[model samples]
Target: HEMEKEFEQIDKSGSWAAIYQDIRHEASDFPCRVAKLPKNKNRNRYRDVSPFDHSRIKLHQEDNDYINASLIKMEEAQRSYILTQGPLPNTCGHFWEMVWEQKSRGVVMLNRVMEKGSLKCAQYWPQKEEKEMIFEDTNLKLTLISEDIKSYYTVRQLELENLTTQETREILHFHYTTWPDFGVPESPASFLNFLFKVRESGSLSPEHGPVVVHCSAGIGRSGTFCLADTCLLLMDKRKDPSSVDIKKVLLEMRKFRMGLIQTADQLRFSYLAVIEGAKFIM
Candidate 1:
């Protein structure tokens, strides 16, 4: 009776949370678990040279015998130093590093993963295989997610500014906009305009890439927009808007890429956005 009385006192109309709470009970009939940050905060700093630098270094005879046989080319050091640094945003392994190096021409695509912030890259988005392939193909060189700090947004601000100066380019940052209650509402027209801005920009450059997007895990909104952008490029190729279906394109991204379209809500968001709104799918 007390519980019923309390329930009566509360209004639940148009409450997504209310629906979510009920569903939670249906699944587990238990209290919600606290959500924590992912393991490996990217705080490990430099790439782990453990396998090569540790035991291998100690075994000098083997190291000398193996690597010393190879020639070391002596190149002059440039007065303009090429600084290599990072707290990488994504670490699936050495493959990610290799991908990044190949994509980044080493001039643009500055390494800003550690100081600013990063999204949890290891988490796979099941629906988008190509997205994951992009993850693998770009080898993570193209999109280096920031590791923006919480509780010290101010410190991050200064750090980011320093980063921009060093890289000689404006650093790109990602934000979901939804959590801060800033998602561009589902307005089909404005969404298309969003894509046009990026599309006409013609390049992701120092002046161009201060990007942001989000979904349930920042991927839904973020990934959809990302996928939609790819679709737009394809459309621009054929000059056929009718050929574009962002959701289907993104779902296709899931084959090799895990969790690219992880949730029905996210999938629906992408599908409807293409038909109903004018934005890029990411």
Candidate 2:
């Protein structure tokens, strides 16, 4: 019954696409300095994937110091996330550098290396024990300890070491393998299961720095994950999932990163996931 009400709200609120366009128009007016930075030239995989100035993650290191990523802070939900584009061949090290500088403990990857015979992301992690990966740009090395592969997801226990400091930390990599770009998963059940697995790892907790979430553009599938998770957490805490305004929450989130919840379908899926997740929380 509550889910039905939420659907009605979505219907009466008018077309989500129209609202999304409005948000994009608003975003255009928001200034971005990434294009001006010499480091960002030829660094972003796509021309449209630059980070917004207000929330862009600036690297402390001097070399190749630009990455197409944004810091999204959900203060109400007590969550902070670095929403970024998939690493290009040149920016792979910058990706790890941002992780090191931000002290991120987990990376939530929503896209595969090859999607529909097209390359989407660089192979940033170590593929096998025989081939250890070293990112010279960031002065770091990555070693894969173990991998647990499932039908729809894969979790790996990885060790990230700073060669300069000779210090290392365990970082969890949660890869949702089945979710397609600009689309939702097979079902909310599988999606929620993946969400819970990440939550269980305690990487999203405030004790750790913001988790890094990425996809092809870093705004479509990545935004859906963040939106669904944030809404569900708010519902759990408020004890009234349906009372939460999905549109309002998404608008606030877009302040930190542009073009979140990219398509209307992704927006609808977020509502469905939140509705289903409320049942679990209740």
Candidate 3:
């Protein structure tokens, strides 16, 4: 009820939009290194979806490499995530290059290939029995090892290898297929279940490198997921979920990437999920 009332007031006052705009203004101050790379422009899925300059991920192997990806660090929660746009047809190899270079153990994909009859993202993963999806640009190959399909999500085991180095690593791909592009999940229960499943895999732990998370633009649903997950973990750690300041944490997160928690509905959903999730974790 308290959360609902605060949301209602924010809605009536139109404070959310102000906050979002403020975040964008702050983000615009960053360098945007990728914007200068003309070759990487076509690799971006959307013109407005670019990584912030200060926090953008760089490819050490190439002097002129750029990808629409950001590295967000939540040191307080001991969590690090690479929030990035979905790979374009020409950027899939670059995507794998990032996964290998960053040493990320898992990729949390929140969007489907097609949404509302549009191509929201490219099919970047290897299909079953297809053996491997090679990225000629980065000299890397992603081989599908196994798959586990659930009701709302699918988990796949993949082996990412650097062709030149002959080094390989296993990566987990968590694909949430049913999430709407601009909407929340059907229920927080199902979402929480999926969250716990990811947690159980130990992918979000500090021992491994940052986990890669993405949607179409890697901001809306991506932000909601990361916000809710971070808040829930903070709640569990602090032993008092209500003590969390969702707004403050969100503003902090926006420092690393632009336009997180895109809508009031997504913001409201984050609170609801965090509140409901505390019941289980507490």
Q: Give one digit per residue, the lDDT tens place, for model 2 in 202-244.
A: 9998898999999888988899889889988887777555678
Best candidate according to TM-score? 2
Better of 1 and 3 by TM-score: 3
Lowest lDDT 10-residue stretch of candidate 3: 20-29
Candidate 2 ranges with C-alpha deviation above 4 Å: 1-3, 8-14, 22-28
Query: Could you tell me every candidate's TM-score relative to the true structure?
Result: 0.36, 0.92, 0.90
Deviation in Å, model 3, residue 131 alpha carbon? 3.8
lDDT tens digits, residues 47-146, model 1?
2211112111011221111110001111111001111112134422232232222221211111122222544233321122223223331222122323
Q: How does residue 200 of candidate 2 score in lDDT?
A: 95
Candidate 1: clashing residue pairs, number: 40
Candidate that beats the other on lDDT, 1 or 3, i.e. the better one: 3
Winner of 1 and 2 under TM-score: 2
Q: What lDDT does candidate 3 reach at residue 270?
A: 83
The better candidate by TM-score, 2 or 3, is 2
- Report the lDDT of model 1 for residue 253: 37
